[PDB]
Ligand binder design. Structure first.
Ligand SMILES: CC(=O)N(O)CC[C@@H](c1ccc(Cl)c(Cl)c1)P(=O)(O)O
Ligand SMILES: [Mn+2]
Ligand SMILES: [Mn+2]
Lengths: 379, 374
């Protein structure tokens, strides 16, 4: 039958791609809610006109006053929309901190949560896990989507290892000496139109992969010592699972986010024609190589944060956001990003306590941000 | 919860590796029967001593005599062992045509048939399928084991394509002119027939037919890709564009162990891919001009009935002539084609084992006729 879908973050890359999948598949999906920030208010208003969906939310009060007929407006607009809208699936594609409360509200309604928002798991951790019931959260990103599919290859008890693939970034194979010279431009600083400026840099620094490893632990309940990373420059294999008998099951497709988005929306049922398949009529190779963890320690650091638990992964991520922004601003060199994360993390053991509230998560993030600022400035 | 296993073809490669899997896993598996041809009495005698199993079948009467006191001996010994031994799993690793009757006997007992003898399914066709319940036949072949695992990635209605990987053999990339000069040594662990069939691409053709029969997927949705490393063992493409693939360093103990204990995986059966060191998995299209054995397999399979029995039997005779030094390498697949072209009457579905045997008898004769013309 038809799934009723709420799209939170409807004007970003994931949300707009999801709306395309939904427009292509009216027999499978109907939009019953849209939420956005207000920075792209014009897009949201066009979406209302196009879909006919009037059940919309705008977070920015200032933006909302340009309109006069938006039912949900102001800081917790998305949350209130989620609380009051009958839906089968909530796609949470909101950015950063504003994803957390709508995640918690989505879980409470009993809807399936198709989760793109990284902060919900990386920062919210045990708050989100204690709120979700088994199978409720379906991951939207390609690696986690790949893992969910490969885990079908056996029972939970038959799993030996999860292996996430990583592109390796623009500096794959670079030495420590090479990294010293890295400029914001080289590391992917471009005013690109849809994605965020952090995404390309987090890829380059291996911090993105670190974040994906944390999310993997929380999504699938696999110990950190059983979550490996391999560099795979083609990004065709999106991740793999090794079972206790020696068998490895991998998911492969040409890079296209409509695949994992369509599957998250329809889970557990695949959406016919979502993406193009691998074509073996032409010759290709799929290459694998180890990550040099001496040059790129961001994943080791993520495992350290994850094992410590509580709010430590919130600290990891907040330290990154601050350090990464300082590098793009010319305040630090490239290797200093992960260097500052390590230094902030090693001072952060007070945050190993489990959060009781969203406010507790916010407090850890505040401390981490300030601590990282002090590291950058020399204070 | 111990599974009682009968091992047919125990002295060959698959047979010996299965005994190793069973020996490493006494809590899951127990050998209750052994069958062999009698050409490797040293191995069989060691197997009796090591397993303690005296419930043994030896095909060759003279060889069984040289051992003495064998409970089952002569051409139908393996079949009789199957009929009379209580078991949960029959591993049929017999080679070529002698596998058919034991396969049919095994299915009739209700036991799981862990099938390494693909000939019995390729030749048996619908006769074998009608004898089996759903899931009774569990493939030992690495490609089919991989497909079975990958099919867990969705529901039957979500399957778009099955993709069989092929090593390419030692003559990958070679021209038709190059193949004229191939010697039996150049086309030489699995067995002289299996090694040759890998080189000629007839093994892949046989595996294409096996796939259709095992999984019920149309021939025009079974694809072959050349993958030199043989680490990816096969893949399934689903309707959304996702492909699920199975990968491991080549080691038959993995698919053997899974076949014996299906659906349950056997801890430590084989080594996993090591992603702490670099590797590359290469893919290339098959050269269907130089190697048309796979397309001929599809043509035989589509024709159906006893036509797949013809394909296999014609191969067995031409292959034997090549190994004897009587014909050249490219003539093997040439003869299969000529024989299939003449095989009009064999599109009829086998009602009994006798129909299959009639088809094979004719195919062997027609193959010899083709050899004589060279
Ligand atoms: C081992 C197996 O399944 N075979 O049938 C042997 C033949 C196949 C083969 C050849 C070599 C290797 Cl290493 C493997 Cl795993 C498989 P081919 O792709 O050449 O037909
Ligand atoms: Mn990703
Ligand atoms: Mn095979």
């Amino acid at each position: 039958g038809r799934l009723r879908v709420v799209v939170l973050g409807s004007t970003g890359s994931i949300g707009t791609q999801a709306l395309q999948v939904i427009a292509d598949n009216p027999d499978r999906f109907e939009v019953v809610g849209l939420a956005a920030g207000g920075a792209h208010l014009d897009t949201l208003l066009r979406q209302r006109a196009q879909t006919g969906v009037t059940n919309i939310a705008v977070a920015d009060e200032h933006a909302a006053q340009r309109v006069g007929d938006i039912p949900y407006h102001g800081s917790d607009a998305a949350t209130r929309l989620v609380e009051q809208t009958e839906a089968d699936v909530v796609l949470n594609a909101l950015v950063g901190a504003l994803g957390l409360r709508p995640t918690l509200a989505a879980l409470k309604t009993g809807a399936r949560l198709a989760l793109a928002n990284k902060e919900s798991l990386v920062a919210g951790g045990s708050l989100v896990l204690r709120a979700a019931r088994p199978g409720q959260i379906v991951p939207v990103d390609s690696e986690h989507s790949a893992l969910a599919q490969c885990l079908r290859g056996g029972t939970p008890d038959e799993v030996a290892k999860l292996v996430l693939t990583a592109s390796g970034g623009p500096f794959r194979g670079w030495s420590a000496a090479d990294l010293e010279h890295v400029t914001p431009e080289q590391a992917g600083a471009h005013p690109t139109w849809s994605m965020g400026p952090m995404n390309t840099l987090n890829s380059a620094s291996l911090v993105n992969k670190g974040l994906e490893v944390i999310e993997t632990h929380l999504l699938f309940g696999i110990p950190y010592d059983r979550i490996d990373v391999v560099v795979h420059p083609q990004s065709i294999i999106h991740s793999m699972v090794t079972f206790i008998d020696g068998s490895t099951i991998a998911q492969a497709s040409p890079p296209d986010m409509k695949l994992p988005i369509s599957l998250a929306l329809g889970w557990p049922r695949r959406v016919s024609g979502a993406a193009a398949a691998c074509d073996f009529h032409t010759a290709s190779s799929w290459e694998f190589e180890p990550l040099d963890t001496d040059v790129f320690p961001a994943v080791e650091l993520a495992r350290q944060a994850g094992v410590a638990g509580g709010c430590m992964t919130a600290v990891y991520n907040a330290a990154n956001e601050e350090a990464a922004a300082a590098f793009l601003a010319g305040r630090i060199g490239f290797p200093a990003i992960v260097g500052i994360i390590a230094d902030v993390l090693h001072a952060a053991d007070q945050w190993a306590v489990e959060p009781a509230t969203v406010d507790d998560v916010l407090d850890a993030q505040r401390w981490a941000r300030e601590r990282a600022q002090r590291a950058v400035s020399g204070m």
